[PDB]
Design an enzyme around this catalytic site. Structure first.
Site, PDB file in Angstrom:
ATOM      1  N   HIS A   1     -14.315  -6.399  -3.664  1.00 27.17           N
ATOM      2  CA  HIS A   1     -13.565  -5.577  -5.062  1.00 27.17           C
ATOM      3  C   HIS A   1     -15.115  -6.111  -5.698  1.00 27.17           C
ATOM      4  CE1 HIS A   1     -10.041  -6.518  -2.801  1.00 27.17           C
ATOM      5  NE2 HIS A   1      -9.415  -5.190  -3.850  1.00 27.17           N
TER       6      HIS A   1
ATOM      7  N   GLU B   1       0.988  -1.013   0.027  1.00 29.01           N
ATOM      8  CA  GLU B   1      -0.182   0.063   0.076  1.00 29.01           C
ATOM      9  C   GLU B   1       1.091   1.003   0.379  1.00 29.01           C
ATOM     10  OE1 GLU B   1      -3.939   0.204  -0.047  1.00 29.01           O
ATOM     11  OE2 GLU B   1      -2.968  -1.756  -1.551  1.00 29.01           O
TER      12      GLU B   1
END
Ligand SMILES: *[C@@H]1O[C@H](CO)[C@@H](O)[C@H](O)[C@H]1NC(C)=O
Ligand SMILES: [Zn+2]
EC number: 3.4.17.23
Lengths: 598, 196
Positions: free
Chosen positions: A488, A358
């Site tokens: 997702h 990230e």
């Protein structure tokens, strides 16, 4: 002639100074919402969201007047064409608000849904940490099975009517934008047009995905055979030696990554462990130390150290019951120099590598920040999810782990250590590929047609059995929705970025190791001190969308398409060994074997 | 035995000027202790052009103009002789043979507030570049094509200036920097300002 270039250049230099603050003010309301799900924040989020979209429609309408055929500078043709595209404005205002309720309800159901103990309804598990600890560490088949189906029955069954409406509305929106369906809308990030000789098309993405996956199935069938052959030691009456795997015994709630199978499948257990989870707990590391060690890797290859606003404003630790915060890791660029991570970390090797990943999104977000507003975005979806995973390929190595003190200084880099490392990497990177391809194939068909409403779950479980080699513990009917039970799918993101990044990460890794002047096997290349390898990457990160992805790739690694060769050349020392291990056992699977019927 | 200049009334004024319409103060008949400004701990930029920064307490001048304004910290690299970009071209231009000092510091604790400040403006379009030390405090709608603009904003017709929007959490390249530009003058006549 030149008037309809200068008119457009003037217009975009209105947009880039007018848009920039409306986007910031919108982003800052979403951060305040995700850091505590509270109606007072949801009001601000809806207000600042309305201001942004209501503005975009006016500027889009002004941009519509200029002839698309008259502008000649490539970057202004890109930057103007983004305004001329309608987007969501093609729907009626009631129908658009209907869609925005669906997205916010699906998101809230996922981020706050739960299951509770059948004797003790006073005790309830959220997904993180509650059900995640069960699926990551429990070796009770019965508890695993309960945790697996209870999420699908208790929350996946709620999302079925919402996901039907979402499929309907997004298709009608996409079709009024001249795409064939909303799948075609998503494949549209890979499209390159106008630049001849570097073109790419929204249909061709399907050809190159399905053509590259054929060259990866042989490594997967051997890795699946080895994992199945060893799980029979742990769950002896439950697994067939010739069938597909039971879904709840994979190392994860969905089977997205097989990482947590490692302790059950490690080749050479007599050596010091490559999973440094125990060594980090023993040395008592913490959230801030994990992100500080992530920061050291990027700066030692010559990329920038983190903005002070990152360290002050980020949420790097779970806020606890005081706040109903979201805990799915995310990297945020708010605009106006403001970058943050939201991530509920705890001391683990998985969260250590995920902190590198990230933070890799933030480095790309810091690099293209000089570009003008509508090009200030990644070169392709896959590059954005690849630039972080290039650092985890390097940071996970026993070589690197010894250099940061998570392994003992007497650790030996012998020919059993090399297979103990590659078998760990293969669980993550090859175990995720068939799942990642197969899930998106289902959505592409569900938006396109050729999967009717009464066969959504039918064809999903047929494809998991046929393509992935995984089978459901007990049949699910068309009242359920299993796909919606993944973030997702629930929260409206394209999944194919996780396939194409898995090819790009090795293409870039090979080409960076040569800049670090490395020789020897690719799977022990550390780029970590090479400022030359960092510069070879940085001079491509600073582009944003300004040059097509085909050319931005081709400049760095000498190919104008995704390529499987560097992936296979990384795992070949493992693949040869798995072919040896599998010589006495079945390779592949029957699709007919069943955990419920057999 | 001494009499110091009113630098306090500029370097710690409460409210600074919007860059498109910058403030100018004359300084005259006085002693200016520039060494105190040079030895300041807060200043992030102190580039002096044509004159050495330690030297100013030795010099004497006819007149000194202190010009003040506030801009994004990233645009402070346009306050120098010879630069280009929308501050240097259209809001405040120093000449190619400037003699003076540029002084600047971060002010995010003062010039920025929650929800966004939106006071400070800048000019974003102009029909030609400013001559050095010119000002253009006007609001007639800029025309980008062959249609007469009739004094109303619209297609090809843009309002000339745009607000900054400082919130407290914006990064360093978008935080408010206060700037003061000192532009000493010798005018073949008496000196009226000196170092002590
Ligand atoms: C290397 O590993 C293989 C098994 O993976 C083993 O047969 C071989 O003997 C090892 N090398 C040496 C030098 O012993
Ligand atoms: Zn990511």
């Amino acid at each position: 002639q030149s008037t309809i270039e200068e008119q457009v250049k003037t217009f975009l230099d209105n947009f880039n100074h007018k848009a920039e603050d409306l986007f910031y003010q919108s982003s800052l309301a979403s951060w305040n919402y995700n850091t505590n799900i509270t109606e007072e924040n949801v009001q601000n989020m809806n207000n600042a969201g309305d201001k942004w979209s209501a503005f975009l429609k006016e500027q889009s309408t002004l941009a519509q007047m200029y002839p698309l055929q008259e502008i000649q500078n490539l970057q202004v043709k890109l930057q103007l064409q983004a305004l001329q595209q309608n987007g969501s404005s093609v729907l009626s205002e009631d129908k658009s608000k209907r869609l925005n309720t669906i997205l916010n309800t699906m998101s809230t159901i996922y981020c706050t849904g739960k299951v509770c103990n059948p004797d003790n309804p006073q005790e309830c598990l959220l997904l993180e940490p509650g059900l995640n600890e069960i699926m990551a560490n429990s070796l009770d088949y019965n508890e695993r099975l309960w945790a697996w189906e209870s999420w699908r029955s208790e929350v996946g069954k709620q999302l079925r009517p919402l996901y039907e409406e979402y499929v309907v509305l997004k298709n009608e929106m996409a079709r009024a934008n001249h795409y064939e369906d909303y799948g075609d809308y998503w494949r549209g990030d890979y499209e390159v047009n106008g630049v001849d000789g570097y073109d790419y098309s929204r249909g061709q993405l399907i050809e190159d995905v399905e053509h590259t996956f054929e060259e990866i199935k042989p490594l997967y069938e051997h890795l699946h055979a080895y994992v199945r052959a060893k799980l029979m030691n742990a769950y002896p009456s439950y697994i067939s030696p010739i069938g597909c795997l039971p879904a709840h015994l994979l190392g994860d709630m969905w089977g997205r990554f097989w990482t947590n199978l490692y302790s059950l499948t490690v080749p050479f257990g007599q050596k010091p462990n490559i999973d440094v989870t125990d060594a980090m707990v023993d040395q008592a590391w913490d959230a801030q130390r994990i992100f500080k060690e992530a920061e050291k890797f990027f700066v030692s290859v010559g990329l920038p150290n983190m903005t002070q606003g990152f360290w002050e404003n980020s949420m790097l630790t779970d806020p606890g019951n005081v706040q109903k915060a979201c805990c799915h890791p995310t990297a945020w660029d708010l605009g106006k120099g403001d970058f943050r991570i939201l991530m509920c970390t705890k001391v683990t090797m998985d969260d250590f590598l995920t902190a590198h990943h990230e933070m890799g999104h933030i480095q790309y977000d810091m690099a293209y920040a000089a570009q003008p507003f509508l090009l200030r975005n990644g070169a392709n979806e896959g590059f954005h999810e690849a630039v972080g995973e290039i650092m985890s390929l390097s940071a996970a190595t026993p070589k690197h782990l010894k250099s940061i003190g998570l392994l003992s200084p007497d650790f030996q880099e012998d020919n059993e250590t090399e297979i103990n490392f590659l078998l760990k990497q293969a669980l993550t990177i090859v175990g995720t590929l068939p799942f990642t391809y197969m899930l998106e194939k289902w959505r592409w068909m569900v938006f396109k047609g050729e999967i009717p409403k009464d066969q959504w779950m039918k064809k999903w479980w047929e494809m998991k059995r046929e393509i992935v080699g995984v089978v459901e513990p007990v049949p699910h009917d068309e009242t359920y929705c299993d796909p919606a039970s993944l973030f997702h799918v629930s929260n409206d993101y394209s999944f194919i970025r996780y396939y194409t990044r898995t090819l790009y990460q090795f293409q870039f890794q090979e080409a960076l190791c040569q800049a670090a002047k490395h020789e020897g096997p690719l799977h022990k290349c550390d780029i970590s001190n090479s400022t030359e390898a960092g510069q070879k990457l940085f001079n491509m990160l600073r582009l944003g969308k300004s040059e097509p992805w085909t050319l931005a790739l081709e400049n760095v690694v000498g190919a104008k398409n995704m390529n499987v060769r560097p992936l296979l050349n990384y795992f070949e020392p493992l693949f040869t060994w798995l072919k040896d291990q599998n010589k006495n056992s079945f390779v592949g699977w029957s699709t007919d074997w069943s955990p419920y019927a057999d | 035995i001494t009499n110091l200049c009113p630098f306090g009334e500029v370097f710690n004024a409460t409210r600074f000027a919007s860059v498109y319409a910058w403030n100018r103060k004359r300084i005259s008949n006085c002693v200016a202790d520039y060494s105190v400004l040079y030895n300041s701990a807060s200043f992030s930029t102190f580039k002096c052009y044509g004159v050495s920064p330690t030297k100013l307490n030795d010099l004497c001048f006819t007149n000194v103009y202190a010009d003040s304004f506030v801009i994004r910290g990233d645009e402070v690299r346009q306050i120098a002789p010879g630069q280009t970009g929308k501050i240097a071209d259209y809001n405040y231009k120093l000449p190619d043979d400037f003699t003076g000092c540029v002084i600047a510091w971060n002010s995010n604790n003062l010039d920025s507030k929650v929800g966004g400040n939106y006071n400070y403006l800048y000019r974003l379009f102009r029909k030609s570049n400013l001559k050095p030390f010119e000002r253009d405090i006007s609001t007639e709608i800029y025309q980008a094509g062959s249609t007469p603009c009739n004094g109303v904003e619209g297609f090809n017709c843009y309002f000339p200036l745009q607000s900054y929007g400082f919130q407290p959490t914006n990064g360093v390249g978008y935080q408010p920097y206060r700037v003061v530009v000192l532009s000493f003058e010798l005018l073949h006549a008496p000196a009226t300002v000196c170092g002590p």
